[PDB]
Swiss-Prot record:
It comes from Homo sapiens (Human). Binds water, Ca(2+), Na(+), K(+), fatty acids, hormones, bilirubin and drugs. Its main function is the regulation of the colloidal osmotic pressure of blood. Major zinc transporter in plasma, typically binds about 80% of all plasma zinc. Major calcium and magnesium transporter in plasma, binds approximately 45% of circulating calcium and magnesium in plasma. Potentially has more than two calcium-binding sites and might additionally bind calcium in a non-specific manner. Residues 1-176, 177-369, 370-566 form the Albumin domain. Disulfide bonds join 50-59, 72-81, 80-91, 114-159, 158-167, 190-236, 235-243, 255-269, 268-279, 306-351, 350-359, 382-428, 427-438, 451-467, 466-477, 504-549, 548-556. Interacts with FCGRT; this interaction regulates ALB homeostasis. Interacts with TASOR. In plasma, occurs in a covalently-linked complex with chromophore-bound alpha-1-microglobulin with molar ratio 1:2 and 1:1; this interaction does not prevent fatty acid binding to ALB. The modification Phosphoserine is found at residues 2, 55, 62, 263, 409, 479. Keywords: Calcium, Cleavage on pair of basic residues, Copper, Disease variant, Disulfide bond, Glycation, Glycoprotein, Lipid-binding, Metal-binding, Methylation, Phosphoprotein, Repeat, Secreted, Signal, Zinc. GO terms for biological process: cellular response to calcium ion starvation; cellular response to starvation; negative regulation of mitochondrial depolarization. Changing residue 553 to N: In Fukuoka-1/Paris-2. This is Albumin.
Length: 571
């Protein structure tokens, strides 16, 4: 009875009210901050009355009803507030915005930050939670509590130093970057659950956990996969309190059973709750058992393959995925899922034939092309990266992907391409052993970002097809894309290029993003133009901006921007 009291008791007041604030900010991204804190305070005091006595007036109501009613005390989403709960929650979920119209969170000076922090810490952490949550509505909520903890720790440690800035900005910039990466990674899980169903997330989990925990038995991995699937189903559905409590329970189970799971969890399990779970999720793959047999004896050579595939299909196929992921931490998860489906398709096609042994014995020989396609793509791209560097690699991927899907909005192309280019810096430094899972998992995260960003305002049929056919084939689908010959080139206009004198004082990131934006815009002018044409126009642009930024007068910018458009429409 009184689920709100149950969650209040398990999580404690501070985590409870932070998680309620996160849930409110993710449901209503346009609602201001004082509205939300007031609703959170009311919810928290009501939960206190409920834990005081669980028979009180409205204590047996569901968390969905309680939160929806509080949100509707103030609340486009006013359609949802005109709906009953089972559909109202689902309306709130459907109105989540991956790209909300909120301004850049520009940071003020450091002295004002430290004075606001010391003035009222609690309010200052609440504002941080509120802004992150409303700008990242699928953020993994307990991880967000860990980020807030580090955010406080940074403000506590730096504001008492001699130079407050030289302590503070590095760790804030790290928190900002790691938060963006965490948000994209969790977005992939939520998209997988919501669009491709529970069976696909279970298969992803089986593959990943069998790679990290190769010494565990299959039943152990199956239990962990069940609990993990439940946790992420709850967070991806907005039930953040349940999700946080069940994640803490899963971390507890894993720390109690390290002997049967992994020898690499010793140091993660001695840490406080939040970083204990964070450490478990990021832990290193354990060493695999020394004497593992070939996977042909029971899955290719056995006479019971068709027999067990019929009687125990689900259990047979995850056993295949489990045993094969154990032996291949060098493969990415998506490649392993591709291999499991190929095995399943071959079994369905061959168990209906006259001599099925002769039909499924050659499936491992169907694995070879699927395995060597990503290896060659990673080698070629890493090899281009070593020669070009991150910025040049980004521009090359940007021109390539702009040619592939030239209908996509310019800001989405720039962001995705830059995050694509960060593969080279993050994984190409690994040897061949462990850079394929790194690279191709990171690509699936960045491509999912492209898919959800394009989902809101679809303009390319090619994006929609790749994003909807098959989640595990999404990277090969995009890689196999080539120049859009049907796309009609775009004219330059007066608003196509908007370059003023503020570019001269820009940071290096923002200057790069503006140049990449121009590069996308003029690739859309002629998607056929070769490297040579592009470099010539880009270098004339680089000469333009450098000359106008040192003229004795924005007057240079207008006149030379007009000639730049006139000359670039020729070159």
């Amino acid at each position: 009875k009184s689920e709100v009291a149950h969650r209040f008791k398990d999580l404690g007041e501070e985590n409870f009210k932070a998680l309620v604030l996160i849930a409110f900010a993710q449901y209503l991204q346009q609602c201001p901050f004082e509205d939300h804190v007031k609703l959170v305070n009311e919810v928290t005091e009501f939960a206190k009355t409920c834990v005081a006595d669980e028979s009180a007036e409205n204590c047996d109501k569901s968390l969905h009803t309680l939160f929806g009613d509080k949100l509707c005390t103030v609340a486009e989403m006013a359609d949802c507030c005109a709906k009953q709960e089972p559909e109202r929650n689902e309306c709130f979920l459907q109105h989540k915005d991956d790209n909300p119209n909120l301004p850049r969170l520009v940071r003020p000076e450091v002295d004002v930050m430290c004075t606001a922090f010391h003035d009222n810490e609690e309010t200052f952490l609440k504002k941080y939670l509120y802004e992150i949550a409303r700008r990242h509505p699928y953020f993994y909520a307990p991880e967000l509590l860990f980020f807030a903890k580090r955010y406080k720790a940074a403000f506590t440690e730096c504001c008492q130093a001699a130079d407050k800035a030289a302590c503070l900005l590095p760790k804030l910039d790290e928190l900002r970057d790691e938060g963006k990466a965490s948000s994209a990674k969790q977005r992939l899980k939520c998209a997988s659950l919501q669009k491709f169903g529970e069976r696909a997330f279970k298969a992803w989990a089986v593959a990943r956990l069998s790679q990290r925990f190769p010494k565990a038995e299959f039943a152990e991995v199956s239990k962990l996969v069940t609990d993990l699937t439940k946790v992420h189903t709850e967070c991806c559905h907005g039930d953040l309190l349940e999700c946080a409590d069940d994640r803490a329970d899963l971390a507890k189970y894993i720390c109690e059973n390290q002997d049967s799971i992994s020898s690499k969890l010793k140091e993660c399990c001695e840490k406080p709750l939040l970083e204990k779970s964070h450490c478990i999720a990021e832990v290193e793959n354990d060493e695999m058992p020394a004497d593992l047999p070939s996977l042909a004896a029971d899955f290719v050579e056995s006479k019971d393959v068709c027999k067990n595939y019929a009687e125990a299909k689900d259990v047979f196929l995850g056993m295949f995925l489990y045993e094969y992921a154990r032996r291949h931490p060098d493969y990415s998860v998506v490649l392993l899922l591709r291999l499991a489906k190929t095995y399943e398709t071959t079994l369905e096609k061959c168990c209906a034939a006259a001599d099925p042994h002769e039909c499924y014995a050659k499936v491992f020989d169907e694995f070879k092309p699927l395995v060597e396609e990503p290896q060659n793509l990673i080698k070629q791209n890493c090899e281009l990266f070593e020669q070009l560097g991150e910025y040049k690699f980004q521009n090359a991927l940007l021109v390539r992907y702009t040619k592939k899907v030239p209908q996509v909005s310019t800001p989405t192309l720039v962001e995705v391409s830059r995050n694509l280019g960060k593969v080279g810096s993050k994984c190409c430094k690994h040897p061949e052993a462990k850079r394929m899972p790194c690279a191709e998992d990171y690509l699936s995260v960045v491509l999912n970002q492209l898919c959800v960003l394009h989902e809101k305002t679809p303009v390319s049929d090619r994006v929609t097809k790749c994003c909807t056919e098959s989640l595990v084939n999404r990277r090969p689908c995009f890689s196999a894309l080539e120049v859009d010959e049907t796309y009609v080139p775009k004219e330059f206009n007066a608003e196509t290029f908007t370059f003023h004198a503020d570019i001269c004082t820009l940071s290096e990131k923002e200057r790069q993003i503006k140049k990449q934006t121009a590069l996308v815009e003029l690739v859309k002018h002629k998607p056929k133009a070769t490297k040579e044409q592009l470099k010539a126009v880009m270098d004339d642009f680089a000469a333009f901006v450098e000359k106008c930024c040192k003229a004795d007068d924005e007057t240079c910018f207008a006149e030379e921007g007009k000639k730049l458009v006139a000359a670039s429409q020729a070159a």
